Design a protein around this ligand. Structure first.
Ligand SMILES: CCOC(=O)c1sc2nccn2c1C
Ligand SMILES: CCOC(=O)c1sc2nccn2c1C
Ligand SMILES: CCOC(=O)c1sc2nccn2c1C
Ligand SMILES: [Cl-]
Ligand SMILES: [K+]
Ligand SMILES: [Zn+2]
Ligand SMILES: [Zn+2]
Ligand SMILES: [Zn+2]
Lengths: 148, 158, 149
């Protein structure tokens, strides 16, 4: 049928005195992500991928990050699209994200009204390269498939 | 239902004395993108996603950067030729999505025009083409405005 | 029907002293990746991602070369109920020239995934002398995969 794909990218600086919140999960860490919102880099990337797949523009032209993700899903449905799946990658040199992946997936699935088997989150370091490798920021990438 | 996906990446240095042309739009700006062609980073990314979805290789294979015939080339002409070869290979384009990442200038005012150019070149309606603009949150060579990056995704069907 | 998309990313440092293996192909160069097959890793991640099976680190704990890992990945994706429809990818390396080796990489990947050659694509890019990629300090790979349940 009328399938569409979307792709999303986000990055935020890591700064002192902020909670680290990724995929809705508060992760123990001495620094957190800097932004106007709670700076949830993963949710932002997914949001952009979903807007992209529905050809609805981007997060900047539309607008915590879970409320924003829920609103994104609403606007995607309003345009006549159903979400089929989401995949994503977080790139962070530190801290370890593996123990938190399942909770992120559950959060995203709940926000998008999707079963768990249609949401994926993957974790990577940057092999100590560049600003990500120096722990100056955290990047997220996302892909979304929808159908009209 | 023989769907295929493709993805594209491009980056170019931002330098004085070149036109800034992104998504086919000439943007008023003191610097422009450096390349053999008009260096349209967004159109190149989309071109690569389309060739990739059709398993036809990449922009270098089809349009050589060492070939003088492409010096200052209009990247919309390249995108249209790509679309023609994708069609010849038996594929129809279903949608395109993309991201441009730049510290400056502001791209929001130009996005609709880029979308319209890409839609024209691909013979798509506007509602199957998307362009997203952002900054790199001050990080890295993108944060320092040394270059501009584009990412693209395309869905086709044979 | 029940299509899903997946995406993958990988990067490795590029220094003298190790061989350069990308897409199962050994490429002569003064530097190598710290088998560190960046392209196969990205594709593996995209496949696990499309199947919503997590990632390469969850399946294959560092606690076998990258082609063996790719083959096992494909087996798990199949058992989870998914057929692979296509793979596309990009390698970003300032040097050496990767174009001569593309068909060899595609052949290795198609073999490992039991796919027709025309459903596997690999693209090559430089980083226009920008960043650690542009300075030849590492090589990046990006991948996209489409599957169907
Ligand atoms: C205002 C809250 O949402 C937004 O518009 C967002 S989310 C986001 N991530 C990097 C920049 N950015 C902006 C401007
Ligand atoms: C010259 C038109 O097509 C090409 O070959 C292109 S487009 C392009 N963008 C960055 C490098 N590059 C090359 C080598
Ligand atoms: C055992 C092979 O799989 C892995 O865990 C991999 S693949 C890989 N590429 C960069 C880091 N990295 C790790 C930790
Ligand atoms: Cl920036
Ligand atoms: K990148
Ligand atoms: Zn953000
Ligand atoms: Zn280019
Ligand atoms: Zn790797």
């Amino acid at each position: 049928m009328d399938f569409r794909i979307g792709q999303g990218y986000d990055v935020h600086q890591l700064v002192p005195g902020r909670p680290l919140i990724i995929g809705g999960v508060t992760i123990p860490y001495e620094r957190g992500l800097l932004g106007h919102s709670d700076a949830d880099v993963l949710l932002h990337a997914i949001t952009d991928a979903l807007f992209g797949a529905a050809a609805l523009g981007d997060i900047g032209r539309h607008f915590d990050s879970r409320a924003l993700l829920r609103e994104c899903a609403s606007r995607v449905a309003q345009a006549g699209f159903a979400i089929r799946n989401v995949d994503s990658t977080i790139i962070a040199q530190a801290p370890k994200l593996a123990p938190h992946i399942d909770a992120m997936r559950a959060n995203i699935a709940a926000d998008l009204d999707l079963p768990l088997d249609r949401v994926n989150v993957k974790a990577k370091t940057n092999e100590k390269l560049g600003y990500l490798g120096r722990g100056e920021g955290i990047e997220a990438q996302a892909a979304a498939l929808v159908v009209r």
